């Protein structure tokens, strides 16, 4: 009775995400609704209490401002819980916004790239391994500029040593894991963004089945500049450890002189 119910935005098996109004202020939220038998990844809160994961790493990661959704409140009911997130408005996620666009100009890619960078970079140093970074999973606040990721229901603790598990998105996810299902964090996390930055400038993903992700030959079917396809192509190297660091990525040349989030509004979505 605490927020107003609106219409679905989106389900899966995992559960249902509805679009909502906080009564008291009229604050714009999505009410996620996660069942308890498909959760599979169990964290503790400090105080013991056992949470989807999801609620762990985004208590982890809700702190101060970033590119992240913000956890507003959470509840437990018998069979499920409930999660109460930020909800932008206007907003489009990437996935829809590349569907109607085509494929981006460099200059927007650059922008929204480095911003999913930034946020990433916040969940790494907040200990967070998103592990389902996607068009999908990114909003665009189109008044702003500004990109947010979402769903952490994939997610883990971040880590040194090896991953044995996954249940993201197989389209991203890296040749170790399609072989040997195994994957290190940061090096898995990079893949998946040479597999996103290749989806905005291409305005599609490079990969479809499982002996193109092993083979990792990168075919490019729209015009992409020289640089920028060096960028890709390293996040994308086959070897885990030949892929680029954060640091080098926001390093490389063809990420300089990016626009402002209210600049990148104002010129690619006005
Ligand atoms: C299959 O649908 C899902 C699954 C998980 C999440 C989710 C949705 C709904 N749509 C999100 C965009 N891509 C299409 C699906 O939304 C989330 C969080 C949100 C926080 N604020 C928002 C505002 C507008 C939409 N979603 C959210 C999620 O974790």
């Not at 967070?128 to 068009?135: F, G, Y």
């Not at 769903?151 to 072989?179: C, H, M, N, Q």
Request: net charge negative.
């Amino acid at each position: 009775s605490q927020y107003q119910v609106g219409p679905l935005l989106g389900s899966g098996g995992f559960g249902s995400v509805y679009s909502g109004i906080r009564v008291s202020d009229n604050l714009p939220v999505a009410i996620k609704h996660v069942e308890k038998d498909r959760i599979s990844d169990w964290g503790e809160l400090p105080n013991g209490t056992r949470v989807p994961m999801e609620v762990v790493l985004l208590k982890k990661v809700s702190s101060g401002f970033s590119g992240v959704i913000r956890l507003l409140d959470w509840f437990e009911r018998p069979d499920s819980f409930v999660l109460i997130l930020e909800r932008p408005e206007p907003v489009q996620d990437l996935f829809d916004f590349i569907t109607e666009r085509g494929a981006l100009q460099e200059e927007l890619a650059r922008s929204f790239f480095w911003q999913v960078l930034e946020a990433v970079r916040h969940c790494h140093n907040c200990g967070v391994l998103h592990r389902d970074i996607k068009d999908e999973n990114i909003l665009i606040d189109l008044n702003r500029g500004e990109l947010k990721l979402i769903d952490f229901g994939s997610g883990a603790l971040l880590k040194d040593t090896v991953y044995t598990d996954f249940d993201g998105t197989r389209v991203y996810s890296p040749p170790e894991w399609i072989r040997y299902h195994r994957y290190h964090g940061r090096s898995a996390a990079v893949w998946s963004l040479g597999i996103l930055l290749y989806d905005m400038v291409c305005g599609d993903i490079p990969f479809e089945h499982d002996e193109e992700i092993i083979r990792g030959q990168v075919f490019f079917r729209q015009r992409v500049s020289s640089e920028c396809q060096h960028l890709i192509r390293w996040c994308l190297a086959l070897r885990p450890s030949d892929r680029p660091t954060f640091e080098e990525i926001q390093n490389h040349p063809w990420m300089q002189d990016v626009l402002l989030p209210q600049e990148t509004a104002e010129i690619h979505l006005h």
